[PDB]
């Protein structure tokens, strides 16, 4: 109902630019610099391949064999179907054609049943071809004996009478640093166990590595390859080189029991490996996706990046190796790689492959009956995208990565489910920096970089979002976006057939990052008319912010863009933003105007640069430190050019340059100490006390924080908690018949203010006093616990003077305003903590004996003093909304804003006069009256407790409190003569009908609103100076009948009414 007038919802100074404990980020400090770990530059190439084939045909080595069925198919050929020399040719050809499909642009060399010297040359030659590039050595010892414990491969002599051993040391001497080996022989570990012992131990911090020597062995030390006819001899090679063919042929014999499904249809599968819209290519695609996923969840960032991203062939071999892991296992063989890798067999994900290969192979019978192209695409991708969704909703933390992530990647490659994958990816990127780091670890970057070439307007809104998130984390993608012409993508999105300025802010932000200190990005965006595009929209606050930050970064340190800025009238379109309500907008405008910069002469630029610096000097005295900081950096920039002019101006002070010097010295004494040190930097650049000395802007770096971040119920609980206490105790104050004062004080607290207490303030919702010295020290005393809670120095400047203490946002987390006699205002968070009290904002109100009052309702701060005007500040905007002429011709001594009626204000004057204002009116002065007729200053005043514009007001120093309501009559309601002269303080309650006055004799008289003397208190001195003559602090508790009083001695005493 009506008492909602007492209880405002206007919160103020609780935005992200006023941030609290962990971050002093909110300007001043530079942005958080990044150090990435996803940087393997070298796309590595396996440029040469050496195939070696030791299979003496129908000459089994004397190691085991025995089996009557025994397997001997190789490269999918029966070697007993062509006679030795042509069989061994065909196997050599097929096997290279097999490998060649994985790396078609390497060079391939085959050698069949070779001598040691032939192999010496093979390997020596493969070095010379691919110098830095990797070499692949494939060895097949099926017709020779098993590798040794001495570390040996077996090869032949010319006449084939002997098996000649070939030391691993010699192979490793012929091939060198970048190389990879495949061994499809029996006891193959044996080779790797030799390799590990070749070189001295050291040169790494992994298991037992050093070089770039990669090894793929077919089975263990004690193991022999399978002889069963269900497998070939070629199992490991066939897994690594023909994975699909093997995976299905295996799936037939094992799982389904083979006899329903003709196994030779696997040779005749329709389509090619390329076409994802054919049954072969799509099955190949599912396999890639399945296997790539098993690797990513099983392996760590680094090892995954080395084996599965770096080298296209190594990627494929180690991918296909995970199939060997599984198949070989079923045939009593346990293959190993040198970078060892954890167990991957029977990972959940092989189940999803098995499902899809069963759904494929049942379809295969009918597709041969006729090429019908009734090829039903597999649900697999849809199914896994849904499992990623499930993860994103339920379990949306860092509770171990999503697993479906490398499948989301594969889906981006075809249009089939691209939009939803991109949607789910963005949704995933949105959860934070950690999730971007994960996306870029999978290898999403270049695929999402390619999609900036897609014209499809469906994808554009999601692609901007994805790129925002990436560039919010990693600024360095700058280089790659410009080199591929991705910058044009976002400029078109700024022109926009589409709508939504939240999306266009992103687009402006993305371009700001692309450009930021990137002279090729500046140049590329300048050629695309980004100035013109941006300036077009300058004819929502976030969008205006980023339109400026984009232009700012584009101008910066680039005379060609600056010239385009002037002649496109950037100044004339930017300047009106300098007076926008949001400090974020103003500060950004200042940054942009700032980066356009860099006797009697006029050319084009001097007009612009004079007009720019004039407009920036106009916002020197701004309410928000955010803006002032930017103005100070832009002044430093301007100062850097015109040092000679500005030195001569500093001589005479101690046309436009004289204004500049005032602004430096004004900034040098600013109430925000970071702004103050900024101004002191500018002074030292001028030489009042190499481009590296210039201070650097922060608005851009702060604002980026928005995007590097996702895109309540306790807050409202403690809000309503206090509202209950307020409304209940309001009624109590009013309706309780307030009996006499209890003269026995509850406290007589020694502040140790040597000079004494000058003001104080009671807290509404807790047992706290705040008191202040004449030199603006602040103590936060507790009157229920009898304990100190904090100690300050409000500012470190030598010229002191306390003027006022107020509470802003009483209803949720109070901030302590501390106004000073020079007009500066400082508002403090966490003032009740032991010593963790940050300065939220400081601005100089009044541009003296300043007098200040805060109107929580309207968000207005009123300030004035020995000035002709009452200055009006709007702390939601942090602007000087209005300068109201007092129309007095003497000083404002006291100043009370109405807590009920926003805009309305009472003002006590030095001559004893008294004025109402309605600051929300074309004529602000409502009425002007004397009351109390001695010509002495109005030491205090206030609006009468209630919902009317009446006024307890006008305690004059002459001694007389005068009551008057200015609706009906000028003359006084009621006079009370508290003191014979020397009235030094007044205290008027917010709700209870009660007042108290203070005397510069010794004395405190409490009165009813009607006039009854409810109490007298005499503040007695402690030694005999007889100086209790600044009984200055007198203040009632907002919601309780509790007085607080302090003098020109040292004791802040509290009293109550029984």
């Amino acid at each position: 109902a009506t008492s909602m007038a007492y209880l405002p919802q206007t919160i103020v100074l609780c935005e992200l630019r006023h941030d609290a404990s962990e971050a002093s980020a909110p300007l001043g400090t530079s942005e958080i610099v990044l150090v990435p770990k996803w940087r393997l530059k070298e796309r590595m190439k396996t440029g040469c391949v050496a195939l070696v084939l030791c299979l003496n045909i129908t000459v089994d080595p004397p190691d085991v064999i025995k089996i009557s069925p025994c397997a001997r198919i190789e490269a999918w050929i029966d070697p007993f179907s062509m006679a030795p020399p042509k069989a061994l040719e065909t196997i050599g050809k097929n096997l290279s054609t097999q490998y060649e499909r994985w790396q078609p642009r390497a060079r391939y060399k085959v050698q069949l049943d070779p001598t040691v010297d032939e192999v010496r040359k093979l390997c020596l030659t493969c070095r010379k071809y691919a110098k830095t590039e990797r070499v692949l050595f494939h060895y097949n010892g099926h017709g020779v004996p098993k590798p040794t414990a001495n570390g040996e491969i077996w090869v032949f002599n010319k006449s084939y009478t002997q098996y000649i051993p070939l030391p691993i040391s010699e192979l490793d001497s012929w091939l060198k640093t970048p190389s990879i080996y495949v061994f499809d022989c029996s006891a193959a570990r044996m080779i790797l166990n030799a390799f590990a012992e070749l070189h001295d131990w050291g040169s790494s911090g992994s298991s037992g590595s050093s070089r770039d020597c990669i090894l793929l062995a077919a089975c263990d030390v004690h193991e022999t390859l399978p002889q069963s006819v269900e497998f070939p001899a070629d199992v490991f090679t066939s897994c690594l080189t023909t994975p699909i063919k093997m995976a299905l042929k295996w799936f037939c014999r094992r799982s389904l029991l083979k006899e329903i499904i003709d196994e030779s249809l696997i040779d005749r599968i329709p389509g090619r490996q390329n076409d994802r819209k054919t049954l072969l290519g799509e099955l190949n695609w599912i396999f890639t996706a399945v296997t790539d996923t098993i690797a990513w969840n099983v392996l760590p960032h680094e090892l995954f990046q080395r084996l599965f991203r770096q080298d296209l062939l190594v990627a494929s071999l180690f991918r296909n190796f995970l199939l060997a892991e599984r198949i070989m296992r079923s045939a009593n063989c346990n293959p190993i790689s040198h970078p060892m890798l954890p167990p991957t067999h029977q990972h959940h994900m092989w189940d999803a492959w098995d499902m899809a290969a069963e759904i494929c192979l049942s379809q295969l019978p009918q597709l041969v009956l006729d090429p019908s192209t009734e090829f039903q695409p597999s649900p697999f991708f849809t199914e896994q995208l849904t499992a990623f969704e499930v993860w994103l909703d339920h379990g949306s933390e860092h509770k171990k990565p999503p697993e479906q992530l490398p499948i989301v990647l594969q889906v981006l490659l075809s249009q089939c489910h691209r939009f939803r994958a991109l949607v789910l990816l963005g949704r995933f990127l949105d959860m934070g920096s950690w999730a971007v780091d994960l996306a870029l670890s999978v290898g999403i970057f270049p695929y999402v970089l390619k999609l900036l070439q897609t014209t499809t307007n469906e994808l554009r809104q999601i692609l901007v979002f994805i790129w925002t998130k990436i560039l919010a984390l990693d600024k360095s993608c700058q280089i790659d976006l410009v080199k591929d012409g991705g910058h044009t993508y976002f400029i078109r999105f700024l022109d926009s057939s589409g709508a939504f300025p939240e999306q266009r802010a992103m687009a402006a932000f993305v371009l700001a990052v692309i450009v930021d200190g990137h002279r090729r990005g500046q140049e590329a965006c300048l050629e695309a008319n980004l100035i013109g595009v941006c300036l077009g929209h300058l004819e929502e606050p976030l969008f205006l912010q980023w339109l400026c930050l984009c232009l700012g970064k584009l101008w910066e340190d680039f005379m060609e863009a600056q010239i385009m800025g002037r002649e496109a009238n950037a100044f004339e379109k930017l300047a009106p933003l300098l007076s926008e309500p949001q400090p974020e907008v103003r500060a950004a405008a200042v940054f942009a105007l700032g980066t356009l910069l860099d006797e009697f002469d006029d050319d084009e630029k001097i007009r612009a640069e004079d007009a720019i610096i004039k407009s920036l000097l106009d916002v020197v005295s701004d309410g928000s430190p955010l803006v002032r900081a930017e103005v100070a950096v832009a002044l430093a920039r301007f100062a850097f050019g015109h040092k000679q002019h500005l030195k001569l101006a500093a001589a005479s002070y101690w046309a436009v340059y004289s204004q500049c010097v005032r602004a430096m010295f004004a900034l040098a004494k600013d109430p925000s100490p970071r702004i103050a040190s900024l101004g002191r930097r500018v002074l030292s650049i001028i030489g009042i006390e190499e481009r590296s000395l210039l201070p650097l802007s922060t608005i851009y770096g702060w604002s980026c924080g928005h995007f590097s971040k996702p895109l309540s119920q306790e807050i409202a609980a403690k809000r309503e908690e206090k509202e209950k206490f307020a409304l209940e105790h309001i009624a109590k104050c009013q309706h309780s018949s307030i009996s006499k004062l209890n003269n026995n004080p509850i406290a007589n607290w020694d502040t140790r203010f040597e000079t004494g207490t000058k003001t104080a303030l009671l807290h509404p919702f807790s047992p706290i006093v705040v008191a202040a010295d004449e030199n603006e020290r602040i103590r936060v005393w507790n009157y229920e616990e009898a304990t100190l809670l904090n100690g300050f120095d409000n500012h470190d400047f030598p010229d002191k003077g306390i003027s006022k203490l107020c509470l802003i946002n009483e209803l949720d987390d109070s901030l302590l305003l501390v106004a000073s006699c020079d007009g500066s205002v400082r508002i403090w968070k966490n003032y009740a903590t032991k010593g963790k009290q940050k300065l939220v904002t400081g601005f100089s109100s009044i541009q003296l004996n300043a007098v200040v009052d805060w109107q929580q309702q309207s968000g207005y701060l009123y300030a004035s003093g020995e000035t002709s005007t009452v200055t009006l500040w709007d702390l939601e905007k942090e602007q000087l909304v209005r300068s109201v002429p007092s129309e007095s011709e003497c000083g404002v001594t006291a100043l009370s804003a109405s807590q009920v009626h926003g805009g309305q204000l009472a003002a006590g004057f030095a001559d004893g006069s008294l004025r109402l204002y309605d600051v929300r009116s074309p004529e602000p002065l409502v009425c002007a009256t004397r009351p109390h007729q001695k010509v002495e200053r109005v030491v205090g005043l206030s609006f009468q407790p209630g919902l009317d514009p009446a006024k307890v007001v006008s305690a004059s120093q002459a001694g007389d409190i005068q009551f008057l309501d200015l609706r009906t009559t000028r003359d006084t309601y009621l006079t009370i003569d508290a003191h014979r002269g020397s009235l030094t303080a007044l205290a008027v309650h917010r709700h209870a009908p009660i007042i108290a006055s203070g005397s510069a004799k010794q004395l405190i008289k409490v009165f009813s609103l009607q006039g009854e003397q409810l109490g007298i208190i005499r503040y007695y001195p402690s030694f005999m100076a007889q100086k209790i003559g600044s009984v200055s602090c007198l203040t009632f508790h907002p919601y309780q009948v509790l007085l607080a009083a302090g003098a020109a001695d040292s004791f802040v005493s509290i009293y109550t009414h029984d």
Partner: peptide
């Protein structure tokens, strides 16, 4: 020169 083939 991408690892997996894209269809733009």
């Amino acid at each position: 020169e991408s690892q997996f083939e894209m269809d733009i």
